[PDB]
Design a protein around this ligand. Sequence first.
Ligand SMILES: N[C@H](CCC(=O)OP(=O)(O)O)C(=O)O
Ligand SMILES: N[C@H](CCC(=O)OP(=O)(O)O)C(=O)O
Lengths: 430, 430
Amino acid sequence: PVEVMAENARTGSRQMQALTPAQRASAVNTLADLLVSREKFILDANAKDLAEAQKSGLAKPLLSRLSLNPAKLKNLSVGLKQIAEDSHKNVGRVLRRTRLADQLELKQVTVPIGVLLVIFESRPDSLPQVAALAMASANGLLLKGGKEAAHSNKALMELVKEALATVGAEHAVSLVSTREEISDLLSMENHIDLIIPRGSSDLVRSIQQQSLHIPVLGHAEGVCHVYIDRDADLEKALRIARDAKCDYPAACNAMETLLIHEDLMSGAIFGDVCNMLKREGVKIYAGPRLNQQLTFGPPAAKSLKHEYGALECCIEVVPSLDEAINHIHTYGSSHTDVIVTENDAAARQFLGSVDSACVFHNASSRFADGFRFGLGAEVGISTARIHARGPVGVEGLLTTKWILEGQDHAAADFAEGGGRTWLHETLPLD
Amino acid sequence: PVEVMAENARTGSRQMQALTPAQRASAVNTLADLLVSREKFILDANAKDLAEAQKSGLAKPLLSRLSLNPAKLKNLSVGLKQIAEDSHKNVGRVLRRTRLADQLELKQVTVPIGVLLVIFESRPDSLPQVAALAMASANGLLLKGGKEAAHSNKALMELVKEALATVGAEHAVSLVSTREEISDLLSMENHIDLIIPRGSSDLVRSIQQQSLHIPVLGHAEGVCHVYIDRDADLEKALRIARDAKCDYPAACNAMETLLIHEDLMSGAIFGDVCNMLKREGVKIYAGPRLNQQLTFGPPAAKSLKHEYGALECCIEVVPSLDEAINHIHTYGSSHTDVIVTENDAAARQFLGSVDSACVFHNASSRFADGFRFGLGAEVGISTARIHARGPVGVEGLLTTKWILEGQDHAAADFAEGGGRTWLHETLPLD
Ligand SMILES: N[C@H](CCC(=O)OP(=O)(O)O)C(=O)O
Ligand SMILES: N[C@H](CCC(=O)OP(=O)(O)O)C(=O)O
């Protein structure tokens, strides 16, 4: 069934709630061990299921992401080991230690979010990742993929279920797929808490539109942007654009535009970068100001708010750093940004100005992946205006809960009628 | 108009964004000064407008909350002074200082939320509160009340507008009311960010239903709950129920139920508490188990998930502490809770168990107001599953923004093809 799953999930969440000390670390340890001890099973499952899917040939991005080999298995094992190691005290943590009057102290402890419902096109290299995520943040977890690789996902589900049942006393994790009517449970409320799409632009778009009245994660479209300044040496910009566009054209956080100080048009930079893009075979559009400054020009642009995911990168140019700010905040989804120059003043004003999901200074918008931030294995990428930004580390799955241990106190007793006063002494947090 | 207001708001937000050092503190200082220097104006405005509204006589809760006197003005002045004092460094704060490789350091700075849209029935003792809130968290602000007290609210708007224009160089705060079609702008997106209802149960309910796809605040219905244990001396429970129900029956966070160890039914506690409730004239319903244990009994109960706001408090009893947990998590909106006993073991298990918006140990659910937490003047009360819980302090209006200042780095350069490595040295945060 469906709802009984969610309730089993909540129950088990509270079950494993009181089991932090070396428990869940040991749990994901044994999970890694099981991952490295039942490989032939899961390897052959993935192989046969993907092979059976090949006869259909539904789409090359999927039919590529579906891959899985012992290398990826070693990678997942080591990543989950890292999560185990650094996941010591992400629950049951204090954040403030404050007193009000005699024997009147409070704090602000951490606590799970509840019953998450992750949705992704079958990239079965993800399932154990998020499973360890849940079992480290102790918040029980549902899962829901697509018909593709369903058998392999089922095998991984057996994996994680056994691994949890080792110690944990409850299967506080479940899979529900095979025609489960995304709109049906998506419409349901008061059981699921955080919808974490991961698959690709299709899922996140279809959700953000479809979804209504539910806390979600995941951005809309990774419309990056870049800037270069009159005080930037060129070869920087060159290799930067290389890392930016040349590397992984289908990446969510992959750059999709560019912007340059108009004055340095007279620096041959344009020719260098565009000849380089052609050396790497990159389709080129541009914008109105570029249509102005030159005669022949690359083709027109459909809409500045587009996305390509392949070797295509629009290009505009403006005179004002502030005009740059206007443009970034007007068109792009403000998922990312970057500045390249040597002056700090313009740089620091910029960094202090834009409200993207991050900024950089002589870096590569390919940097935003969490793993590159030493942030522990991320769970997604958020661009929403609340509760999480950019790389959503494991901390992006926790909330607060105030506790108070008084003796005999009350509200009216603190008024002038009683001998109760406020102190607000911020104790050293334990 | 409407949208131009929102855009003026965003512009001014970024305007005052780069003006932290003693600027906004001075701004709210001068705001308090103006509040204490143009009283006759605003006092007479409130007086005349409320008097004109009295002829209608729309509702006593409103026609009571509408009050305003020099005492309340002194109170607002001192509260905003407190906000000024403690609002030094809530923006431009670092949270982590981490390096990856040579000259590759990052951080995680704070940043406003954007363009908030607060909605409340006209309690004009609120407007300057939230205005100082915005101007301390630098996030520009809209405002939208009801037709009542519109003139007084307009006067306060003149107040705050002049106070901001003193220094701030932009009116990054605006009012839009007088028939502004809540559903119209509520439906609008991509300009407003956080909807903060404050008025009363009516507004929050009508919104939560009406609202769709927008980050909101404010709970649904402050269905509290209480527990008492077989290891609690009675007079505690007595004065606790006093402070709980007797004080402010219409309070959002006011208790609405009760629960007692069934064994101590044999302790005359029931008679004491109910005779006390009658001494304070409290309407009484109860629940099925109580219907069982006694014969005559108070009347039936419509639905356990109800709310009264007046001298009415349902009462149930269960044997199992865990059954208590089940009940709290099943019926109540889990806005609050409290335990009263002397054993820590049961107490500590409880506190570690329930997932309300807070818990207590020998306190009064009237405690949850933020001001009682030394938390600075709150802005609302959230019960949502994300981003804020219980007392939403001023910190509940801030987000994150990652910055990076590298030299010439890239993503592929960190692979084995380059001499780039990861360090993850958590520097001492500045
Ligand atoms: N393949 C990813 C890097 C590519 C990336 O941008 O992140 P992803 O969108 O695949 O989660 C990794 O292993 O860190
Ligand atoms: N009147 C409030 C206390 C009552 C209360 O529960 O808070 P409120 O719902 O009025 O914001 C105060 O001044 O702190």
